Design a protein around this ligand. Structure first.
Ligand SMILES: O=C1CC[C@@H](c2ccccc2)N1Nc1ncnc2[nH]c(Cl)cc12
Length: 167
């Protein structure tokens, strides 16, 4: 077993909790924490800003070196970097930002990256400041990810709505 606790099971492989992913990561120290990244790995706000702050900006320093070497990610893409003090690894995943004119169909591709990892602690991709409907996103997650995913949803009101209206 592992050190996750307090999660509501949604399917064979998807679990969910009303929690801050940053606090969940510090407590569990999972193998993989997912960051809700942008293509530039500029971790300004939301999950990305909060994770980076918890690493004392080390995530940003590492990310800037990654971009200087490799260039930007693709929308729907990902890269594996250090988890710093929060996890062994951080999987930086770019969901489409609907406010940036990006294809919502790329959300499925974004979640497909989770399948390369047996277990992950993750946020809902493209939710929050990325502008997509979190209910939709949960549906895409459940219908796309086959590995074991532990979702942290920080917003209590949304968690209650997602968990109660989940099909
Ligand atoms: O709860 C949700 C639902 C989707 C996403 C979101 C994206 C864009 C705008 C609002 C919300 N989100 N944020 C977080 N999820 C987990 N841990 C977190 N920690 C901190 Cl800080 C924030 C945070």
């Amino acid at each position: 077993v592992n050190s996750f606790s307090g999660y509501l099971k949604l399917t064979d492989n998807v679990y969910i909790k009303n929690a801050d992913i940053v606090e969940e990561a510090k407590k569990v120290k999972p193998t993989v924490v997912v960051n809700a990244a942008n293509v530039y790995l500029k971790h300004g706000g939301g999950v990305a800003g909060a994770l980076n702050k918890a690493t004392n900006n080390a995530m940003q320093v590492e990310s800037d070196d990654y971009i200087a070497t490799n260039g930007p990610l693709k929308v729907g893409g990902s890269c594996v970097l250090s988890g710093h003090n929060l996890a062994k690894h951080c999987l930086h995943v770019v969901g489409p930002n609907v406010n940036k004119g990006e294809d919502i169909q790329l959300l499925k591709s974004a979640y497909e990256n989770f399948n390369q990892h047996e277990v992950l602690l993750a946020p809902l991709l493209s939710a929050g400041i990325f502008g997509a409907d979190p209910i939709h996103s949960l549906r895409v997650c459940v219908d796309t990810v086959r590995t074991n995913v532990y979702l942290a949803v920080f917003d209590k009101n949304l968690y209650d709505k997602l968990v109660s209206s989940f099909l």
